[model samples]
Target chain A: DPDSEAKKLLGLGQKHLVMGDIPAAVNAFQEAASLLGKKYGETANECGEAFFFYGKSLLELARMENENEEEEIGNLELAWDMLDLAKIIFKRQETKEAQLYAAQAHLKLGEVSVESENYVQAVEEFQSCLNLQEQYLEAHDRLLAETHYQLGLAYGYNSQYDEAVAQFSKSIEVIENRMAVLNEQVKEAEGSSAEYKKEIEELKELLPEIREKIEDAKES
Target chain B: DPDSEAKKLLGLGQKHLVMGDIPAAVNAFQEAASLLGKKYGETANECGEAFFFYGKSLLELARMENENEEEEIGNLELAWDMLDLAKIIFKRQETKEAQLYAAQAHLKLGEVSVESENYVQAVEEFQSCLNLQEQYLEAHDRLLAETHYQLGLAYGYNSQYDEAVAQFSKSIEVIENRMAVLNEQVKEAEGSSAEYKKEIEELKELLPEIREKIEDAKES
Candidate 1:
């Protein structure tokens, strides 16, 4: 009965995930995790994925739920712990997804830490995030810029002008790189969409023009 | 004592509001409202502003809270009631800020109505919002576009093509007008900032070039 219920909950979680209802998915996954935990002692079917997704769901929910932004201490801590558990499980399972979630966990931790003004911890966590997901351009840019910015501030606080200037320069470099990439991407996307629309209009106009010409030829 | 407490609560609410702490602000305002209610029965000493801000805070919090794609029944009803209370207070005080909050409440109601698939109610609420704040570009644009779109769907359901077409044209006209105004505004604002930056850069370059030219003349 417990196994069946766990399977049912897992199915429900997958459905919610597909529908982009992360909170609902997380709740289902957590329920399944508990049931599976009781029966298989943390060694269950795709329990690692479930745990990972559960954490993902919670992170998303936290973004939505912390509207009043009082720095929800308890929920953020729980999310961190859940992600850590997921990492441990994924390590045993040997999945790339585990690595991705690890990167995300680090990113989330870094974001919250930075918000709380724990600059040193934020830099370390952001670095860890980038190490796991090197090609994650947004995360890479954010981490590089933020870490240097925070470091510059820390240096300034300590009256280290040279070091602060260097850090600030580093932050600017990252920001410029990010802006350049973003501008290029937007330009490319807009150009593509515009060209496609223009082509469609050209075809529509040409078809009508061709029809008119055919009618005139037939009359002659 | 009452004034001091009210002021303190208002200060805290403002801090929370500025920090994007909607829930904290809501809580603070709720507390202030409660405190005021005990002393002056909900309509005393800046209670109008308190209620207005409280409702605004809750409306924003509700929007954030329900981004999970599921609205709690109580949250929706509570938000509506608070906004209604705010409207009453504002009307009594004859504050222009009341009209502003009323407009926001209508907009929020429109959003909720849309989410609930009450297209007519959504349209009406959005219209009310615009009636209150004629220059609310977002509300005007969204209402004009979405109401027409939704109305077209409703008309299509009843095979009313002519009415749908009329609604769609009206939507297009409104959008075109808005786009034109925005484009004009952007053009007007552009030269001010761009020219300032260019002038500074030009001055810097001219200074170095002039210095070199002066040095050359002296040498000659």
Candidate 2:
């Protein structure tokens, strides 16, 4: 019953996170983490996840409280430690979920590096994330696109515009390809709504802009 | 008829670009550019836009060709030159549209710096773009977000994660706030369709993940 209760809390934490209720999410995750503390096997994995989410909630709250860099940094460091511990616990379980969590952790680290303006370091972390995601094959196209986008931005920041352009193009290409399929579906369904019309119009406008960006890169 | 023909060609170019027909877009834009050549006054502005789009199309085509960096660089340089000329012509005309074009040119230059891994130069270019955009007040929130995001990435690449985090957080905050507004709209509408329900479900699932990311940042 206690374990089930902890699981429910974890679920609740996740729900709160979705709603952008950071404080509430944090509370739920922390409660879950405490309830399942130091338990072995699946329980430990759950605990790790709970800790991971708890750390995340704190980080979000810290971001919201923008005036205190010191506090933010402190929160980030603590979160990092918790995530690292979670990674270890997950690894011990040898679950695919662990790989996913590890990749996520790496992504977070890369984000931190980005925050620090350490593009080179960020690149390494993101690359690690990609590699892990690839190994797991659990990453969605959107996630892949996001990683590519982030990598592109990192390269751009690093003054590797060529690489940056390639990454951005790749990101756009993936999205476009996905959209193309969706467009076909919409056509087949003959769904002519204002929303669909508006979306199509936006895409029509955006395509040239994307092309122009590509040109800008070439010019660069 | 001549102006009408050129306008039709421009529209065709845009359509081709949308369909991923880069070569066709390039051809259409080139034809438009040539037809409008040596024009003066507002006609020159139109010509400038034509040249800008022409350059963009060429750049896109060059990227697809992909075998020769040297050739690609040459194309890009030409595109750069055309955009520069366009910028001057627009400035002489004294239009806010000119300011926007100039800002775009700077953005392109920044992209090149990013490619060259000259982050310092990229930062300067992007900063110039932001200044121009700010002065004109013509920039949309999306553009502002993009500029901030780019600036943040540049800072991160430059090893200023503190500033980088601030920028990233700012970008996320803007999007989140926008989404919150949209959520309120959806709530008020009571649009309980499958589509809306699915969106809500996805958001609910995504929230904890977002929070976890926040924790990851803190941990880092």
Candidate 3:
């Protein structure tokens, strides 16, 4: 019951976070992590989610404090620690769900590093995200498009222009391939319907936008 | 496997929404809702989650369009329909988790109505959220404080100052009661530690701020 109760607190914390109440998120996540850690030793797989969110809340809180563009190696440092532990715990579970979560955690870790201007760490973390997604995702899956683009940006930030251009081009391929798949689906249908039409429209527009991004990367 | 796939789509959708890409969210949630409805029937309990998020995605998309705070009775109308069905599907399950989600759905419904300036509906939706939370939460649960305060604001927005004060007072009671519970826990411990110390500090600072909110409602 305590475990289940902690789950509710996590949900409460997350809901507030989504609602943009960082203070409330910090409050709820702290309680969830404390309860979860007590019941399941802090670094156990079971505590991974609570720790991840506790880290996320702290990161967001520190972000809010930096409204004037200055503050917090304090909360910033703590955010890295919890996200760091959560990723380690996630990998230990070794289940598909945990693996996926660990991958998502890397994305956050990359963001944290970016905020701290640790581009080397950011590039590494985003690459970890890409590696995990490639393992689990289909070639035409829309998730991969964003994943590659993020890595491309990470590469660019580290001044690795050639590497960045390659990743950006990879993203354009994924983006166009997604549109191609949906177009084929429309053609395969008895007659195209509104659903396929709208999805295709969205993907079509995205293709040009990212393609131009690749050109920018090349220019850089 | 279809059901599981739909679950991932929902996660993808929710992640995009949080990342502030409303178009991506709309894409994911639509695919999720379409899949779930085909497998489980549109209004079945299983489809509730996808529909809720689909509705939430649409609402967010429309919200983004209203940059000058105008437009979207188009997407806005669709958002209402999905949230409406999600709530219906949620209620049919009659489980604690479903009940909690239904309550969350009501909060969104309240938000939608507020956007449409339908305060009568907003008031009712907020009341439903309160009723459901009260059913499952303990007297001193931190969630109750926010729930009461939201109802207070909903009441105030609808020009029901007396009712607003009543709910605001209830929130203060819950807030103080939560602090009392934590203080007792500190006393019940062998000796106070940083855990209790930190939590108490967060709560102690909240009381005065919330009490003043109640006073404003009183004068109104």
Candidate 4:
């Protein structure tokens, strides 16, 4: 009964996530977390993932709700804590599933950090997410954009207008590359799409274009 | 005497360019081109470079004159022809100076194309410049940035906002990496200043603190 209930809750949470009902997903995951908490014990990595996904679901919901900086920042603070716990659990387990959950956590953290104008942190978090899951398209896109955008911001803060413009210009490149691949994938996967497969293909196509563009844009 | 006179005139023309006297440079280069007409002959590579430089001088003068897109376009056209001729001569001569001249001509063509918003052509020309000199940082930067920027613009035009952002981001990474190297070089070259060296030393001393900040930042 415990195993069945936990699995059912986790399945419902996943379904809600796919449907973009982030808050519902968060709730279901939390329920599963508690159920698993009783059965799997505190040291279980799966229990950690339950909490991690619970936090992610909540983070996504908060992101969707926020219209102001203060609200977003508060939600992000909470999300950050959950993600930190997830990372700790993942490190303890040293398993692939743990890495995937940690990657997802980092990805969400990156988005919140970027919104909060913590550009460098956003870059690092996003990059960490990609390192954990090489096929994480969202992480790649965010890392590429945040790095450049942050650079532009930093340059602007220092009053280096020309350099800032250059950085902005470069940031624009990263965004375009990601968009191209995503658009293509969305186009190709019109019916009964395998979202993960589509995402992987899109990333593969996208990154090379980015590399070529960078090579083309050299200073010399 | 005509050859020597043309050389002297070209030297004066170059001096004018150095002084930012575009109009004067144009006049001097034009005079050199005319004098070389009968000496090395009008079709000679030297004559071609003279024309190329003359056209560039005129283009600079036109830019300074006003927002006359017509004049700018006309000058660019002439520069293109002259540069083409110079390139042909360089290909035939295979001299180092000729190659350099050809590279510079291609670079200038790229700049003009970029200014005129002929982005694809700009990319092609800049790439040609880089092919001639791999370490040509300016050409590299321009080509990479402009290609991604233009690609992103196209995506934006197509209403792919997310894609556009990703492309822009790729462009940004290339620039950031370039700037990082530049920053490192600048830091290394700031010799004999105790304050500057102290800054470096201080940074080195604070490496652990910086790493901690990075770790803290990524806690999410």
Q: Residue A83 in candidate 3 has what lDDT?
A: 93
Model 1 residue runs over 4 Å out of place are: A1-220, B1-4, B7-25, B38-45, B56-71, B92-97, B111-123, B135-176, B193-220
> Could you give candidate 1's per-residue lDDT for residues B14-90 as a string of tens digits?
89989998878988988887777677775553566676667667667767765454454556666667666655665
Instruction: Give chain B TM-scores in order.
Output: 0.56, 0.68, 0.77, 0.59
lDDT tens per residue, model 4, A36-114: 8778775577677777777677678677875376766676777777667777777666666666777766776776676
Regions of candidate 2 where Cα sits further than 4 Å from its true position: A41-43, A91-97, A135-140, A185-220, B1-220
For candidate 2, the docking band is incorrect
Question: Can you tell me which runs of candidate 3 are displaced by over 4 Å?
Answer: A67-71, A184-220, B1-220
Error of 3 at B57 (Å): 56
Model 3 achieves a DockQ score of 0.01
- List iRMS (one decimal) for every candidate: 13.5, 30.2, 37.8, 27.2
lDDT of 4 by residue, B1-220 (tens): 4378678988999998889888789889878877776577656866767877886776686577555678877776776666666566665666666666776777677666655667667657765765665443453253455455555544444455666677667566655554554445444433323343444454345335433433433342
Q: Give the 10-residue window scoring lowest on summed lDDT in candidate 3 chain B.
A: B186-195
Model 3 clash pairs are none
Considering TM-score, which of the candidate structures 2 and 3 is the better prediction for this target? 3
* Alpha-carbon deviation at A149 in model 4, angstroms: 63
> What is the C-alpha interface RMSD of model 4?
27.2
Task: Name the candidate that leads on TM-score.
Answer: 3
lDDT by residue (tens digit), candidate 1, A1-220: 5478778888898898789887788789889877766766664435666666566666666666644565455556666676667656654554556666666666666655644456576667666765665553454355556555555554444455565566666666665565555555555545554554554454344334333433443343
For the record, the alpha-carbon RMSD of candidate 3 to the native fold, in angstroms, is 27.7
